[PDB]
Amino acid sequence: TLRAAVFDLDGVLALPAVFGVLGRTEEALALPRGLLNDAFQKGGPEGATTRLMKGEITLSQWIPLMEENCRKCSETAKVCLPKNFSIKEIFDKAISARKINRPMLQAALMLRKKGFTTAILTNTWLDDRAERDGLAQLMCELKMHFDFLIESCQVGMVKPEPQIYKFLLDTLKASPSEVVFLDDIGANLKPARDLGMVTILVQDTDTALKELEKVTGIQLLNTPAPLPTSCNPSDMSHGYVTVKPRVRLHFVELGSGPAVCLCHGFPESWYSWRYQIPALAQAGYRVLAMDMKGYGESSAPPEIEEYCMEVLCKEMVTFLDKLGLSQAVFIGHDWGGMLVWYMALFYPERVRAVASLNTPFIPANPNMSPLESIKANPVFDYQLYFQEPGVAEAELEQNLSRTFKSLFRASDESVLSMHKVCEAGGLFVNSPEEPSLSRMVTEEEIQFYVQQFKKSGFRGPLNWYRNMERNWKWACKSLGRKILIPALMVTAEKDFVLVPQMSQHMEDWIPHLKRGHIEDCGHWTQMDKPTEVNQILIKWLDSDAR
Amino acid sequence: TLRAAVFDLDGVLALPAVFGVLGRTEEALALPRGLLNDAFQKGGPEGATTRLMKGEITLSQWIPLMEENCRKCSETAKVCLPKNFSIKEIFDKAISARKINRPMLQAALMLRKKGFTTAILTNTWLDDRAERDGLAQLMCELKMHFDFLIESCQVGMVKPEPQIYKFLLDTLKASPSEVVFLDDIGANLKPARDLGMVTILVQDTDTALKELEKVTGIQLLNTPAPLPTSCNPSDMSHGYVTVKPRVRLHFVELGSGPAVCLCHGFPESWYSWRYQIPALAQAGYRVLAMDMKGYGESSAPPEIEEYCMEVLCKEMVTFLDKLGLSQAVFIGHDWGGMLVWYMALFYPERVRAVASLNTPFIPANPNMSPLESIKANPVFDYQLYFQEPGVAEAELEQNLSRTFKSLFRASDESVLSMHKVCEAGGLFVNSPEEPSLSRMVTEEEIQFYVQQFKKSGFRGPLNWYRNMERNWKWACKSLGRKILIPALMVTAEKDFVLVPQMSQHMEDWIPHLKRGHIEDCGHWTQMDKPTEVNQILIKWLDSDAR
Ligand SMILES: CCCc1cc(C2CCCCC2)c[nH]c1=O
Ligand SMILES: CCCc1cc(C2CCCCC2)c[nH]c1=O
Ligand SMILES: CCCc1cc(C2CCCCC2)c[nH]c1=O
Ligand SMILES: CCCc1cc(C2CCCCC2)c[nH]c1=O
Structure with a gap:
């Protein structure tokens, strides 16, 4: 029986996903398909993206390493990146265009109101960009509605490593069978499922919420209009x-x-x-x-x-x-x-x-x-x-x-x-x-x-x-x-x-x-x-x- | 023996004086001398300026009445006011150009440090202009350094009426002989003097401060550099x-x-x-x-x-x-x-x-x-x-x-x-x-x-x-x-x-x-x-x- 709900951030609590921008930029700049996504994940657990996600380096240190991976990928594909190509500009826009997925947040709110322990588990970076305040505001609005916020760059662990899942269960003080875990990345659901947690592969929000209400037995979809956030005097x-x-x-x-x-x-x-x-x-x-x-x-x-x-x-x-x-x-x-x-x-x-x-x-x-x-x-x-x-x-x-x-x-x-x-x-x-x-x-x-x-x-x-x-x-x-x-x-x-x-x-x-x-x-x-x-x-x- | 110091605002604690702008605008627009100053004081105690200063009307209500006085004055003088003539623009600029007279404020601070009761006595208006915040900030910085702020528009009395002087002495809880009163308007010093207060006609600050130190026996001029404002924990x-x-x-x-x-x-x-x-x-x-x-x-x-x-x-x-x-x-x-x-x-x-x-x-x-x-x-x-x-x-x-x-x-x-x-x-x-x-x-x-x-x-x-x-x-x-x-x-x-x-x-x-x-x-x-x-x-x- 479920008593905890865990939500991913990119593609789950926030939309559009930043991963979907890399694809959109390839199509707009008519670049080879998956080139930007491949430079992003270059070297898997050893690569620059993993070091960023684990908190080894900041976003501003990562930018030049992503450019070099982008160059390496374009060279192998026998193609040339455009003149005005800038990773910073792409990511600045992607982060700024990313908004709270309001129906997903309401479902998390309804679950927490019915006694569920709620958490955000995310693979994120230490943002030192001149424009970091936008994301700082988003995390602020979001985090206050959940019991826990677990960030890869703060815990030095990353999804899909099994250690982060064991860390999650410890934080929640719950056995895997009492946890629903929602993620848009199939590879990241796999270890949660392997441990015995209920998992939901989030594509469109409606379907994800239908699965979420079917598995919890709590009405999350077609719900009456919620009241605004109230105040707890002691907070x-x-x-x-x-x-x-x-x-x-x-x-x-x-x-x-x-x-x-x-x-x-x-x-x-x-x-x-x-x-x-x-x-x-x-x-x-x-x-x-x-x-x-x-x-x-x-x-x-x-x-x-x-x-x-x-x-x-x-x-x-x-x-x-x-x-x-x-x-x-x-x-x-x-x-x-x-x-x-x-x-x-x-x-x-x-x-x-x-x-x-x-x-x-x-x-x-x-x-x-x-x-x-x-x-x-x-x-x-x-x-x-x-x-x-x-x-x-x-x-x-x-x-x-x-x-x-x-x-x-x-x-x-x-x-x-x-x-x-x-x-x-x-x-x-x-x-x-x-x-x-x-x-x-x-x-x-x-x-x-x-x-x-x-x-x-x-x-x-x-x-x-x-x-x-x-x-x-x-x-x-x-x-x-x-x-x-x-x-x-x-x-x-x-x-x-x-x-x-x-x-x-x-x-x-x-x-x-x-x-x-x-x-x-x-x-x-x-x-x-x-x-x-x-x-x-x-x-x-x-x-x-x- | 003196124990209280009273300061006027325009021309004393704040410079340049707003009255000096009316003169500067006449010269710049080559208008007849004293036309703007005469429309300003039109009808003396019965006029629009007195009603403004007493708090009967706000600055935005006064603006059109000043324009009409300006028209009346130009008509009698057999002259024509320019095309782009706007009282609002003149006063907006005058108020914004007016800054704290730092040496006068330091003297007030030194007097208050030596045990003097300090006050600002001013003929002012209820400012409802879109740009009122500038003046609101000036009054804020200034007022906190004094025991009392006495504003004509708040007390319904005006300088040079004898009632405001009796109100001042009551507020200060001091007999006239224990008060120094500093003003740039001779007409406004007259009732303070008549009551027996020490008066100083403020033209240039240095001379005014020389008189102020001669009469109080406290060094106000050529003083070592003062420390910044400190904090009183209880305020x-x-x-x-x-x-x-x-x-x-x-x-x-x-x-x-x-x-x-x-x-x-x-x-x-x-x-x-x-x-x-x-x-x-x-x-x-x-x-x-x-x-x-x-x-x-x-x-x-x-x-x-x-x-x-x-x-x-x-x-x-x-x-x-x-x-x-x-x-x-x-x-x-x-x-x-x-x-x-x-x-x-x-x-x-x-x-x-x-x-x-x-x-x-x-x-x-x-x-x-x-x-x-x-x-x-x-x-x-x-x-x-x-x-x-x-x-x-x-x-x-x-x-x-x-x-x-x-x-x-x-x-x-x-x-x-x-x-x-x-x-x-x-x-x-x-x-x-x-x-x-x-x-x-x-x-x-x-x-x-x-x-x-x-x-x-x-x-x-x-x-x-x-x-x-x-x-x-x-x-x-x-x-x-x-x-x-x-x-x-x-x-x-x-x-x-x-x-x-x-x-x-x-x-x-x-x-x-x-x-x-x-x-x-x-x-x-x-x-x-x-x-x-x-x-x-x-x-x-x-x-x-x-
Ligand atoms: C992160 C460093 C921890 C630390 C350093 C110091 C000193 C070490 C010598 C240089 C000045 C700081 C005192 N106390 C601490 O906890
Ligand atoms: C029908 C009574 C509800 C009501 C009460 C009040 C007052 C009653 C005493 C406390 C202050 C509010 C004002 N307006 C109303 O509609
Ligand atoms: C400034 C008016 C003073 C005042 C008005 C009212 C009422 C009078 C009837 C209309 C609503 C306000 C109640 N108490 C007061 O002190
Ligand atoms: C010469 C001593 C003055 C002094 C004291 C300290 C310490 C002494 C213990 C409390 C923390 C400050 C740091 N730097 C100095 O110059």
Whole structure:
């Protein structure tokens, strides 16, 4: 019975294979068939290619030896290699054209999700080319989805030598009969088969995956669309910045490129962006996923005033100052969305671009006020319930698991009767004691939020709603301004509080505003529709944020 | 008696002044004298410029109002503005040409070092231009050297209104007679003077600084060359990555740009790079200053094998993997220098560029060994003393303050008799009980190292020297390779162990090797000659690391 799956890289997890380029170059340059492939394998286990694959020499040392083999082969074949013949150019192109075989990676992901130990076993080189970063990125994206990466040049052994197969089994801590091994080179399957492993000669992916599901008894083909990569809290880089004597800000950090600062809403965490973090880092951005003031590992002072928008914005500016960042793109959701618009209004020099999920840009009415406005719309009643210190805290802190299970639900699954929260005396007066698990969350993800809120609870988070008169006065100073920096507004169809129609007048204040819209999406945007959120943000980032 | 110094920005801390561009544009376009300056100030306190300076409107909203004032002024003067006349182009250029007035900044730095409270008081705008980042960077570099930054557009008040002066005094918590105020606009000095503050009308910097030193009694002019900006540990962003179950790695992070991973030697800290960190971040790099395994906030496992080069390198690769970095430039000193060369030899795909301070590239002799080689050269005797577990630990841990005071000394100041460490039974057998403070370090910097080594001591750090046979075997696998990625070797004249002549054969292994060399520089390169280290690294980074 199988418990391990091993994948080759070239021709299996990455396509097109580099071996197929040697053939394509012969045909294009009308060279004798197999001349390039023969110079490549010249001298078998004694040759330059084996020394390269074993880690004896680097790719740049190998290039001239391949040229000499190419010359030797052309001489024997009584032919002449062209004028502009360059091994470097051929291999540079081949490596750059090679992409992840997404359906093969998904099958490996599905196998690992069902309890399989997964590994990449590859014959590779030590790449010292000026352009090595391309391959370095490919190996990075790939390796993180597997338990083991075994590279010939790092282990000093090569496929098809029997030693590498014994090394593989040892690494996996599995007997040969419990291993499926997938390779596009028949010669490399032979020793795995001889040892008793299940082998699959990979020609086209579909057939290979049909064999893979037949042998494992797990559906890998015709599978529903997978969710994006999520985050394991313990595998992230955690950062800590003191912004003032009693205030430290915590964040999770992933990627290189322009800085993208993610700002969650109420009552959330950096972990609310778990499905965006690997995606935005992969798209070429440096992600800074915040624990906002009052949350997780960030400080949670008890004073209401500590959570007014002016103080919160000033602290985010200091946060940039202490990290040495002149700008960041600011992306917010719910309360984080309100803050990002105010970051754009008050500090446009520090904001590369601004995007909000659900939260429209709410300009202060100097004639009315937020209190009067909140009373006018029954959907905002819960904000009045949040006013009196202690009341909402007691209900939200009573049973943490019930709190997040009741809150973190899709539009259909909801248990909250938003209209009369004050009258009924609570958000969960009609919610069960043991809510069911929403289709959006696992038990483990709920438990991460539970552990996070054990430190400071709901005082600091609730205080974000207790600064209406303070925020209104501060906002009124911006009544003559406009947002003229790149901006994105993302509406959610089924958000019953932050309704799409609430954003209809935003172009008056933000004339160059770009939009995004997600159908069948509730309040918890990032986890409700992760794939579509990622697609909207990546498209807007690449076009408007550089 | 003075205790506060206030500086204006345009024409004082930054040059050339933007007001001087309006005059230069009139002369270049042969326009009537003062036309551009008059359209700029049109309507005084009621005008568009005042609304901009108070934060009522953004720079992009102001541009069209300035054009209309320019039209109105040209009409009255019975003249015509040119065809290609654009306020945006003029201001874009003016802002970009404006640089920090380095001698004025040094005087502010010297005043702050002597106990003065320093502030920037400026009439500025909310910059929403596509090119705002330039100014955002200037304000960033500048603000960090002052206690306060007061911006008109953020306080809704403007110079010369008396309210801003009362706001300034309140912020400073100082009476007017204790304040020096420097401005290039006579009209803006007037209210400060009226209140009783010492004022300086800044025309040329030299004269202004002569007045400033005459009034404060502190030497600001003709001062010795200042050291680069250092780091305050509590103001840095601290990062933590788990690289394996029992190993977490700590680092300090500053800047945006290509990742630059700094690797200290023995017995050091991330803080050994304190003079390089602000400099390299300012030069356009993302600095990652490590606490290497066994040091500071990084884990310190007790087992010798945990500190062999193979394990240490694998962990640095995982460190990159967990941060989502495909590459970093690796810069090392002493033991960190040895590791960076091995990172280049074994993982060239993950290394953008490699630089070493003092440590040459030491290729294994398959015929000899490191033990035999270490015995052959008496300067390396201390490494034999480091072999026996517990012995070096007892001496180094006995009195931490004495340890770092005895070690961290320039070549002349040294108290160690390196030749016979074993024979004499210790590194400090001829060092005083209370060593004097070296010219390179303050009491506070020594105390930071003391507090750092209180956590794990010298076991983990000493174990880096206890892997000779393990490192030799691993290194022998690389005997056929070459380092062909961008590489820099920096030698130190007065290092008595890692002597410059030890690097003389490096070109055999690294043919494209670039070099740097520092005269009158001992073992502690980074703190001995910080200005020259910064100059060598920045020059090589900008030319070879992108
Ligand atoms: C700057 C506005 C201040 C503010 C607005 C709101 C609401 C008002 C109704 C529309 C959505 C935001 C809640 N809390 C606040 O502090
Ligand atoms: C139907 C209830 C779901 C919902 C809740 C909220 C609030 C409720 C209290 C916490 C903040 C989100 C906003 N929008 C919604 O659609
Ligand atoms: C890879 C070499 C291993 C090694 C060398 C040295 C010395 C040998 C003499 C020259 C400088 C480095 C000290 N410790 C080691 O583990
Ligand atoms: C003259 C002694 C100064 C000195 C010490 C060291 C060692 C001594 C033990 C700790 C590591 C550095 C290397 N090079 C030098 O010039």
